[PDB]
Amino acid sequence: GNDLRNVDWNKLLRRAIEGLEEPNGSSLKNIEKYLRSQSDLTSTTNNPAFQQRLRLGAKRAVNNGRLLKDGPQYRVNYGSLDGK
């Protein structure tokens, strides 16, 4: 992709959450699978740092309250994107 910028992992991560719609949220593996399937952003998905960026971003996202840790699945949390 001609666009070389760091997307808000939360956007792709959370967006992937709604995409799967997996009951009671979805796991990181399933979430990454959906994003990886995507074709428009294939640039990011194909980007090796795709899984790393999502894995690292997801970790912080939870620490910020962006996502919800519910077992092997994670649900989107609007309470506060920034966190706290």
Solved using: NMR
* CB 47, CB 38: distance < 8 Å: no
Closest to 18 measured CA to CA, from 81, 76, 68, 80: 76
Q: For CA atoms 76, 14, 29, 26, give the dihedral sign.
A: positive
Closest to 63 measured CA to CA, from 42, 84, 48, 39: 84
CA separation for the pair 21, 83 (Å, rounded)? 23
Residue numbers of the domain that contains 37: 1-84
- The domain total for the chain is 1
* Contacts for 70 with CB less than 8 Å, ≥ 6 apart: 24, 25
Tokens of 17: 């959450």
Termini Cα distance of the chain? 34
